[PDB]
Amino acid sequence: KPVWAPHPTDGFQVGNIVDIGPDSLTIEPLNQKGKTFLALINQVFPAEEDSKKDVEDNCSLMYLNEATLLHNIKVRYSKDRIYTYVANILIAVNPYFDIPKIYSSETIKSYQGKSLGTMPPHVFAIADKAFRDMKVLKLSQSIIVSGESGAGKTENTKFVLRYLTESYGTGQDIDDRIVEANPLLEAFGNAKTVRNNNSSRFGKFVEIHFNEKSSVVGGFVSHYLLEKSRICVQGKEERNYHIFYRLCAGASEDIRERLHLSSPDNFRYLNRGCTRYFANKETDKQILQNRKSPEYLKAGSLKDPLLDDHGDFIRMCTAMKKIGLDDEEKLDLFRVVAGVLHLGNIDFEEAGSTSGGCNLKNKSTQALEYCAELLGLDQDDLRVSLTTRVMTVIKVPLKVEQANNARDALAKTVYSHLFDHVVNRVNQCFPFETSSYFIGVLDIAGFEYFEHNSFEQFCINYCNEKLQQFFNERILKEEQELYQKEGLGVNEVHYVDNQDCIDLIEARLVGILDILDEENRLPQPSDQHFTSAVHQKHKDHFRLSIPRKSKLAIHRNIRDDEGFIIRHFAGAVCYETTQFVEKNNDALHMSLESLICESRDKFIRELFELSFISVGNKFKTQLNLLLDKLRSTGASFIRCIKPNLKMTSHHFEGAQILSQLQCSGMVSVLDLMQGGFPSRASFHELYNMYKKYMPDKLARLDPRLFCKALFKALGLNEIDYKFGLTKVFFRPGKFAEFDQIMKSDPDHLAELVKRVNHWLI
């Protein structure tokens, strides 16, 4: 009798239906006799009879729907049980605190070789299942970790990597390397944002490669779309990459002196953002007074349960040592970092009777000297390349705005090349000649939109269209095509394909990426010319509109040539096209490229061992290699859920979590997953595995008939499995029973055959 009906902040609330009207149900909130509210008939759901219970698998719920799913994960979360299944898919709700012992070496050992459902839900069980499928099916595997910014994708990726390397490694130095590589990547690719103190500003696919014996031989990291804009300016609540603050907070005085470092408020590339360190009472006393900005001294430290700038600098140096980086390479990296900081302090003032030129401000003399010294450049060549443009064979003055752009382009390119070097260096620390298979973990930002959307949002939302299509093809298309071919009679869940949105962005010649590249190649590139060419070429495209077509008031003043709206199925996004041409070029101008290639420092020359490299098309190629890997492997899915927007523990925001369950597509697949068959094996393979152990009476049976006798003898029933035309299928929550049937050990096989022989008489 009690039902779940809508609630503005909790998503749902419990009540009773007390009336029905046209298009409405009158609900009485539980224990509030007299009170009533109207709800739409289709927004009212049956509730589980026991409101206090929780189930480890949402498929076990008598009434599985968005409301009972929300309630079950809420009950579990209130008890620090952050992991819950939807059959073989994992839901992970961010606790925002360290739950004791759940990631221990002892917890790791308890999950090894255990079937899904045998142990409580855990990221370790998803990792173990991928390993077992890899070894049994002799097929590489992918674990896709998804969710909003700050939901827990990076933390869960790291738990998967740690579980696999600790369980299936050799007990050597190289096993720890794949794990120790992360504090290094995060130092250069992660930053404080309003949504996550440790936000990933690049995407990644981390593969652990195994030999024929299913033992770890090494790894490989793919990195995508490092955010370049961050390198030069941040919003007051955000920071630049962690490395800058770990270095300022933790470097020895010898390094501080050598690199001419000071408190972060002294650097333009840090001082528009937050200049405070992540520290606690103990670590703050370890940071020297000369490292602390005025804001840090007034407001105190930033608080985080994970991040500590001083502690993280020490842990990063230890990680560098463990992976094989010598002190020389560590100082080479720090020198580039400081060189970029000093570059940002180079200021310009107008010159010429019509302000057509510029001069370095006299107060920027020291910044010029320190930068040139740290980057192995001549001061004059650097001053010249930043203040003039070479073009017949003339050296022309740059205006102040153009000099700022030259400095920043060099800073972003140097930093981005340093990041590429760091990722490649990490790959060189765990190399392998050959491998039989891999387990790859995908950790990349999903669909996102803000008041202002630029080229970075465009590429990530493009990536999301391509991955969403893979998700639909794997979970909906391929799964149901199997059920159909096997005659299972599973109710069809349909989806609308998004190839028209993908083609809009990526088609050869006509796609937005190709039209943008066209602009970069033109004599005088223009964001406006690019934008009008997109509107002109796709005038009849449903996924495209002018910014004026938006309902929102913020887009009312945006001109047709100043942006476009992409009608992504996840929501219509208005992109402001200013800087799209600049952001699409990964190559430095020739005169800045020469300056840096001719550095006196071998390390700097080695970072760089009409200049145009398309960021869009480079990313399209990387994404297509990733999609080739995903399509050729088995996929396991982890859906990370952010419980609130305040980074607090024990604060379950019902409507926020519901919205994520709906937007993730989780709600749309509930019935398909509950009525589905995630485990299957052919009658022929089962029969062939048991054949040599069988007596004549057993071998005489047709494979389908042998399988039936095997299942009957073991006490299995229709609630556990269904027979297809050529395969047996096991339902959610029947993984342990399926693994017992599949276990290929001679002693186990002979034992089950003995049981069948005994049942037959």
Ligand SMILES: Nc1ncnc2c1ncn2[C@@H]1O[C@H](COP(=O)(O)OP(=O)(O)O)[C@@H](O)[C@H]1O
């Ligand atoms: N299972 C977890 N245990 C403890 N803290 C966690 C867990 N998952 C996430 N966190 C916390 O939440 C923060 C944000 O998580 P993160 O993995 O970086 O998110 P995402 O990569 O999805 O943006 C972490 O830095 C950490 O403080």
Ligand SMILES: [Mg+2]
């Ligand atoms: Mg992350």
